[PDB]
């Protein structure tokens, strides 16, 4: 039960995240 397609698993703050956490991927 990880992190979702929404939210990517950082190691800075060792967590789920939006991914990216930006506007447009590239």
């Given at each position: ?12 703050v060792?967590?789920?995240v ?9």
């Amino acid at each position: 039960t990880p992190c979702v397609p929404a939210e990517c698993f950082d190691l800075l703050v060792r967590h789920c995240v939006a991914c990216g956490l930006l506007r447009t991927p590239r």
